[PDB]
Amino acid sequence: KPAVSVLTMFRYAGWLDRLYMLVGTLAAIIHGVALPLMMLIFGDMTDSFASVGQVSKQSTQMSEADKRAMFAKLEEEMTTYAYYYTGIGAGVLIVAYIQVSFWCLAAGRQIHKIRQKFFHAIMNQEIGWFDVHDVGELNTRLTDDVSKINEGIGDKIGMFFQAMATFFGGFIIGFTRGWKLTLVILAISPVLGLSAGIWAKILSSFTDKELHAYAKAGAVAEEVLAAIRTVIAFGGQKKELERYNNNLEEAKRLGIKKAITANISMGAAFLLIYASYALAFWYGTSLVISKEYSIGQVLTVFFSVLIGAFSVGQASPNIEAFANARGAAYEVFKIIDNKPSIDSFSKSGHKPDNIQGNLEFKNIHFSYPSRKEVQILKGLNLKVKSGQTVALVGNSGCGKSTTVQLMQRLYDPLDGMVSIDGQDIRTINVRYLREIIGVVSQEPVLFATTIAENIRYGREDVTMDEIEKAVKEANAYDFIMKLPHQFDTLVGERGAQLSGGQKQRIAIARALVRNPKILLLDEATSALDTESEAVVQAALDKAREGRTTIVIAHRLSTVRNADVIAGFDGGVIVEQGNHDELMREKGIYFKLVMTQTKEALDEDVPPASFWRILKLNSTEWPYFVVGIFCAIINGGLQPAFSVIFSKVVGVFTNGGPPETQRQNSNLFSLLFLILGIISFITFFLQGFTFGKAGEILTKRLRYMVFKSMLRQDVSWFDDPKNTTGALTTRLANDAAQVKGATGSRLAVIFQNIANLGTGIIISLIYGWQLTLLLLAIVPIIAIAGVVEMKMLSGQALKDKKELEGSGKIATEAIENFRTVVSLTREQKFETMYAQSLQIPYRNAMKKAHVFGITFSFTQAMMYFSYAACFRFGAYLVTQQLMTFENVLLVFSAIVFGAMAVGQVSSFAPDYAKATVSASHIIRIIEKTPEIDSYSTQGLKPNMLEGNVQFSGVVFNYPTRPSIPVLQGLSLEVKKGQTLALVGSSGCGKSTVVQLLERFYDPMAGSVFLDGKEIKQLNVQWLRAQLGIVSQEPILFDCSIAENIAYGDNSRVVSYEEIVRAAKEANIHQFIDSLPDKYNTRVGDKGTQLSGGQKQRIAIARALVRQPHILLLDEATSALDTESEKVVQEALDKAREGRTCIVIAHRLSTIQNADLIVVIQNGKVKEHGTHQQLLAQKGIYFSMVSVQA
């Protein structure tokens, strides 16, 4: 993974930028050391109560002389301590504000220049750059990687400096207040980073082991869902459900262990930090009895050091974000500092005023940049006279268009030069070159705007009248005037789709507006019907007037009208001259003449479900029974801590017998380690309870889910929201993550309710007014912590949604770069981009201010809470209300308990994502279809007749109830006789075949099989005797024997049936010939096969079940040569003794059908045999008159 040097990355910072960064950092530093200072002052705070405990404990000394020496003293000390606390907080809001605000600000101002110059840089690149690069990922880079470099030069490093300042502040205050104790805790430190480092490796080892564990089930997942039509059709749903399941109980069982080890990692962590508490206090409290360190000093150094330690942990992601931001900056700066071979942005060449129009190509050697290994043009020589129209032909290779591509100077020749007049094409400016060179591509292209605007892109300073005149010059003024909104009619990608002819003509106009003296036409008529081709070529011929025109077309019809015809054989131009010369010399030209004669949309729709998801995991009560109790223990573990902590310093603040200062000390210290042991117990237990639970739940769930998917109708997979990828992804992620809402959430809610629950009881007994103040302050800060992540993500989305206005412009400007570059106007697109950017950049100032005041609002009262609680608490302890130890206890319980619930909320997966990803699962499983293939109901007679009779039956697709497909068409087919379907196109060609297979339910009307209605029969048994062959047959990545045997399920197929079904489909010859026999895998993972052979296998497939009904629907549209003959020959011998329904567009193998049905609109307007309908001179006579 690459990265830019740090200095190079802030290259686009300036005066004010460097200023903002420096001031910001300076604020970050002082914000950082604020917390350790708060710790020192905390120690200096406890050291004062320590003196008022011991005196008032032992016996009695002075009743009237204590209120003056103690009560009046502590008020006088807390009146200054309050100033210290509140002071530091009041400063903190300011310094935090400057920090976040300024960093965010400067960052934004840099990014703004970065994205723009990135866009400009992409545009500056020549097409040779676009050839070797993927425009798809480049387009995404402009949004994702610039956003990625935005994060990591802003708030993140502000919080990095703050974090490091908290580190050094903590260690400095530590060493300044305490020498020994700091070295103690730091001596404990290297066993934590050694532990967090090995346990991270263990969890990451099984994590990458899961990816390629379940992938063996995802393979048979995507394979099924992709081939689903043939699956339901061949009813292999059972064998496929099983085949899927057999790869589940080997991939998540691997995950059980990982869940376990993860929990053990967390447990070990708590064990070791609790151990550090035990040891640290065991040393410090024994250090205060020898009256070396005070009690408050122990706290000062312990807190400051621990805080400075965790500061790095909270500095780690902030420096990681800076890191990978440099990695992104590498790609972007690369493009910006890159000046291409052709610029193409500033004039450096001449601008001829003649301007003539004489073309010349002298000794052109050129090969494409993508493949330097294959040379294209070798000594290309070709001159073109003024106004003379020259055509290119020969069917050599890309060379043709390459010449055209060389002409607008897209590429530059390897050897030789392309000269216009007496000057080379490189000795002239490139902008001006392409302004005087028009071009019409093989595929037209229009930008999402108005026709008028699409024209403007050819020339900006054109009046409406000029636009009109130009439109007329392209024979486009007719249909455009017919458009509803005239010239303001929308076009392009989204809105008002046009025909290829119209779209192309508009482009002819666009080019014509430039008034070029040279006109290039690369397959302009190509990919167009014979009717539009007339008008298009008509405009073109009138556009070749007064202009020097080179033209390449696949159709030699419009070629003979040129002045010079040039032929291409290999890399050189061999035959050149008039039409008659090339006809007379019988060249390549003559030979050709004779040879040619959804992510958001998904998550939005489901409502629900409040805690019903748990009912899914409910199948295993015990794991949860142990889990909940364990969770309550691990939860009550935290309140215990804050109690025992308050008891450590309590015995050194409330005095008492000095002889009992040690006896107590060592008790509590050791007890902490005890509190550690049980903490490693709970997590070891939890990882066996919930950990297993959600995993079993996962496996099981997927099974159910997958089964559910196979139950659905075919109408559900046609639904635009359910694709094989989205379904397999739904299966791979949301099915696993459901566990989040089951065990883990119970664990969290119980650890929380135990912690804050029991903890609030304790703090309520040890304090009335103080606890009531704390249960007031803490929730208020907690609400702020929510609002913090509300206005953060909230205005994070608002910024992106106003950034799509740019994203569109960029995207359109990139995917059609090769187009715009020929119309120049790249700078016009840049200007559009900036005009789109000017609005969210203006909202970056207010943005920074907002992040500022929000962050500072949260951060400010985080110290004011200390100030309030300790002031009020001091007010308590000083007066008759007791005591200090109780103040510290209440504080610790409620506050650090409240932080504890934060950590517990952060552990488990996100409940929101869990629930929404669960709802899809519960809806998918509980989804009852119209057509059920699992039902064990149905007739199943003894009659092997098979008569198909559609009566009435009007149908329309559920996906799109617009222009119904079947308007109640009717027909009938008897046994043996085969039907034929003829029409303009599909619908309802395929629809009928699909209805017999029962893929849909017609709104009104019925379809009868034999004497019974279809809906009365068994769904599966109906498809048990229905054979089906689509246009593009698919096989399974298993094997051939299984593929053939896949036709008939719920039975042992064996060698006999397969060889018998192979020999009659005429595929047996191809099997022994290619090593080895039947064991081969198809396809893509094994030996590839041509469509012919694969389809033959697909026939031998449908033939195994001995179907009395074959459904043939546009079987072979892509089969050529003598491969289509043997296929249909193999078909003909299996069409006897079976009812068949054939659909073809060939119209040459329908002449021998028994019945031929001409379906038009939504009904049958012609029926009978071939010659019968032929003598009818209806629509069948006009449809068969195109066979010449």
Q: Which CB atom, from 306 or from 336, has the smaller least distance to ligand 0JZ?
A: 306
Phi and psi for 432 in degrees, rounded to 5?
A: -60, -35
273 binds ligand 0JZ (CB under 6 A): yes
CB-side exposure of 518: number of CA atoms within 13 Å? 23
641 binds ligand 0JZ (CB under 6 A): yes
Q: Which range of residues in 680-688, 818-826, 894-902, 1064-1072 is near ligand 0JZ by CB under 6 A?
A: 894-902
884 binds ligand 0JZ (CB under 6 A): no
Q: Which CB atom, from 185 or from 1110, has the smaller least distance to ligand 0JZ?
A: 185
Q: Which range of residues in 574-582, 615-623, 641-649, 765-773 is near ligand 0JZ by CB under 6 A?
A: 641-649
Residue with tokens 């089930």: 217
Give least dist CB 35 to ligand 0JZ, A: 8
Q: In what order do the strands lie in the sheet with 423-424?
A: 377-384, 359-366, 415-420, 423-424
Secondary structure (DSSP) of 720-747: TT--HHHHHHIIIIIHHHGGGGTHHHHH
129 binds ligand 0JZ (CB under 6 A): no
Give least dist CB 690 to ligand 0JZ, A: 20
306 binds ligand 0JZ (CB under 6 A): yes
892 binds ligand 0JZ (CB under 6 A): yes
Give least dist CB 494 to ligand 0JZ, A: 51
Give least dist CB 646 to ligand 0JZ, A: 8
Residue 107 · residue 13 · CB < 8 Å: no
645 binds ligand 0JZ (CB under 6 A): yes
Secondary structure (DSSP) of 848-903: HHHHHHHHHHHHHHHHHHHHHHHHHHHHHHHSSS--SHHHHHHHIIIIIHHHHHHH
Residue 668 · residue 274 · CB < 8 Å: no
864 binds ligand 0JZ (CB under 6 A): no
Residue 1104 · residue 1053 · CB < 8 Å: yes
Residue 1103 · residue 1061 · CB < 8 Å: yes
Q: Which of 107, 651, 900, 1061 binds ligand 0JZ (CB under 6 A)?
A: 900
Give least dist CB 911 to ligand 0JZ, A: 20
896 binds ligand 0JZ (CB under 6 A): yes
Q: Which CB atom, from 642 or from 933, has the smaller least distance to ligand 0JZ?
A: 642
310 binds ligand 0JZ (CB under 6 A): yes
Q: Which CB atom, from 9 or from 637, has the smaller least distance to ligand 0JZ?
A: 637
Helices (H), 178-252: 180-188, 195-226, 228-234, 237-245
269 binds ligand 0JZ (CB under 6 A): no
- Binding-site size, ligand 0JZ (CB under 6 A): 16
Q: Is 1140 known to sit in a ligand binding site?
A: no
**What residue type is 381 in one-letter code?**
N
870 binds ligand 0JZ (CB under 6 A): no
Residue 213 · residue 255 · CB < 8 Å: yes
Residue 343 CB coordination number (10 Å): 14
Q: Which residues pair with 731 in a beta bridge?
A: none
Distance CA 763, CA 890 (A): 4
Residue 893 · residue 643 · CB < 8 Å: yes
Q: Which range of residues in 585-593, 776-784, 899-907, 1112-1120 is near ligand 0JZ by CB under 6 A?
A: 899-907
Residue 1102 · residue 1027 · CB < 8 Å: yes
Q: Which CB atom, from 423 or from 903, has the smaller least distance to ligand 0JZ?
A: 903
Q: Which two tokens mark 554? A: 């696949």
Secondary structure (DSSP) of 232-275: HHHTTHHHHHHHHHTTTTTTSHHHHHHHHHHHHHHHHHHHHHHH
625 binds ligand 0JZ (CB under 6 A): no
Give least dist CB 75 to ligand 0JZ, A: 25
817 binds ligand 0JZ (CB under 6 A): no
Q: Which CB atom, from 46 or from 402, has the smaller least distance to ligand 0JZ?
A: 46
Give least dist CB 274 to ligand 0JZ, A: 6
Contact letters (x/-) for ligand 0JZ, 414-453, by CB under 6 A? ----------------------------------------
Give least dist CB 892 to ligand 0JZ, A: 5
Residue 367 · residue 414 · CB < 8 Å: yes
716 binds ligand 0JZ (CB under 6 A): no
DSSP code for 421: T
Q: Which two tokens mark 712? A: 């659905």
278 binds ligand 0JZ (CB under 6 A): no
Instruction: Identify residues 903-932 at the interface with ligand 0JZ (CB under 6 A).
Output: 903
899 binds ligand 0JZ (CB under 6 A): yes
Q: Is 856 known to sit in a ligand binding site?
A: no
Q: Which CB atom, from 160 or from 277, has the smaller least distance to ligand 0JZ?
A: 277
Q: Which two tokens mark 1187? A: 């066979």
Q: Which of 182, 642, 763, 806 binds ligand 0JZ (CB under 6 A)?
A: 642
Q: Which range of residues in 118-126, 151-159, 215-223, 895-903 is near ligand 0JZ by CB under 6 A?
A: 895-903
Residue 1176 · residue 1168 · CB < 8 Å: yes
865-869's contacts with Cβ under 8 Å and 24+ in sequence apart are 865/777, 865/778, 865/781, 865/895, 866/38, 866/85, 866/89, 867/82, 867/85, 867/86, 867/89, 868/773, 868/777, 869/770, 869/773, 869/774, 869/777, 869/895
Give least dist CB 642 to ligand 0JZ, A: 5
Distance CA 591, CA 587 (A): 6
Chain centroid to Cα 891, Å, comes to 46
Q: Which of 97, 102, 303, 1180 binds ligand 0JZ (CB under 6 A)?
A: 303
Phi and psi for 111 in degrees, rounded to 5?
A: -50, -45
Q: Which CB atom, from 284 or from 988, has the smaller least distance to ligand 0JZ?
A: 284
Contacting residues toward ligand 0JZ, per CB under 6 A? 273-274, 277, 302-303, 306-307, 310, 641-642, 645, 892, 896, 899-900, 903
Binding site feature residues for ATP: 394-401, 983-990
